[PDB]
Each structure stands twice: as C-alpha cells, then as structure tokens.
Amino acid sequence: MSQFFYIHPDNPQQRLINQAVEIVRKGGVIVYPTDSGYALGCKIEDKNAMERICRIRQLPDGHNFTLMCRDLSELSTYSFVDNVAFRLMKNNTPGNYTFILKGTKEVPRRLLQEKRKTIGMRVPSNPIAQALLEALGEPMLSTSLMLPGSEFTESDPEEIKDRLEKQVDLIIHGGYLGQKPTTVIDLTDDTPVVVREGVGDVKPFL
Numbered sequence: 001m002s003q004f005f006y007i008h009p010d011n012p013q014q015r016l017i018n019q020a021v022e023i024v025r026k027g028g029v030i031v032y033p034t035d036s037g038y039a040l041g042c043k044i045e046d047k048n049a050m051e052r053i054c055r056i057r058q059l060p061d062g063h064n065f066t067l068m069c070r071d072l073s074e075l076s077t078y079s080f081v082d083n084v085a086f087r088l089m090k091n092n093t094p095g096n097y098t099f100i101l102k103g104t105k106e107v108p109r110r111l112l113q114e115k116r117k118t119i120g121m122r123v124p125s126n127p128i129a130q131a132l133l134e135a136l137g138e139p140m141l142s143t144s145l146m147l148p149g150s151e152f153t154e155s156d157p158e159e160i161k162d163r164l165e166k167q168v169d170l171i172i173h174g175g176y177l178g179q180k181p182t183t184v185i186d187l188t189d190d191t192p193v194v195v196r197e198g199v200g201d202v203k204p205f206l
Helices: 014-025 047-057 072-078 083-090 127-136 157-164
Strands: 003-006 030-034 037-043 066-068 097-102 118-122 140-144 170-173 183-186 193-196
Touching: 003 014, 014 030, 014 037, 014 127, 014 170, 030 127, 030 157, 037 047, 037 066, 037 127, 047 140, 072 083, 072 118, 083 097, 127 140, 157 170
Parallel strands: 003 170, 030 170, 066 118, 097 183
Antiparallel strands: 030 037, 037 140, 066 140, 097 118, 183 193
C-alpha cells in the first residue's frame, strides 16, 4: 500500500521531503502537489516507473511526458531553448504552464515524443514541489494527475488515496488544490501554439 505523507504546503518539513526523494531515488512512483493540481512523478532514469505512470495517466497518442524542473536554468539544460522561447518563458515562470520543447541529450530517448522528439517542460511554483526538486537535484519525470478523458486534474488528496493507494508508492498530501491544469504552450518552430488552456494566461503567447 502507498505511503501517505502530510506535508505542510507553505513550509514543508524537510524530513518528509527527504524521505519522499529517497523513495523516488529507489525507483518509486509518487503523487505530489503542484501549483496546478496533483501530479505523478518518478526519476528520469527508471523505465519501469515511467511505464507505471504512463498507465495511470493513460498517456494518449503523441502526448508528451513532462519534466518537472527547478527553474528556467534547469529547464534550459534539458531542452533546446532559442531566443523566442527564452524571452517568453523568462516572463512566464514559475508555475501555471507546461512548455513543449525539443529535449536535449540529457533526456533519455524513451521520454521524447517518438516523431517530434519533444517533451513538456514545467517549473512548479509551490513550496512542496520546489522542495522535492531541490532535494532530488535534477528534474522529475512527471505528468499531471487527471482522470481518464477528464479536462480536470485530481485535487483532493483523500480521493487520490482512495483511487491510487494500490498503484503508487507515495502520496504527498499537500492540501486541496485547484482542478484546472497548466496551460500548455508548444514553443517549437518559434510559433507558440496553445495546446491546452489552463491556469496560465494564453495572451502572452497569442
């Protein structure tokens, strides 16, 4: 059965953050809070964990994975960022957005979209997610946690426990969040395209 941690969302207990990260380092799959709903996460190096997340997320065709990054610098290490993308993201981070970009060699081939070689880059703004990333030291392979065919993300940690405690290794209770997912912007070909309208304002990208 999945472990269940109650972590203060404003001032996360380092002890629990560290334990969560150790679970991730050992190849575990966790559910953690972000500024835009709950998300699934695991280390980028574990293929088995990736597969488990794919099934839980029911990742559709051509749908990108997400790399949860500490900041723009880390994002720029794992994806190819040109002038257009840099200027747009520097003024629209952190939180509320997932940016589709081409992944660099830092990213395992299996995590890149088969045809476009892309992956979603996302910098969370909430304390718990930031603490997890700081402790991990690198991006976390992730996906938003949402029900099949739903346009909404799961936001109730107790509901999440009831639904996935038999399928994940850790669930971090970080409060009751919003159910609106991130706004997804594809920044490739220097032509911003709105893939999904979520929390983030689409206007800066047109």
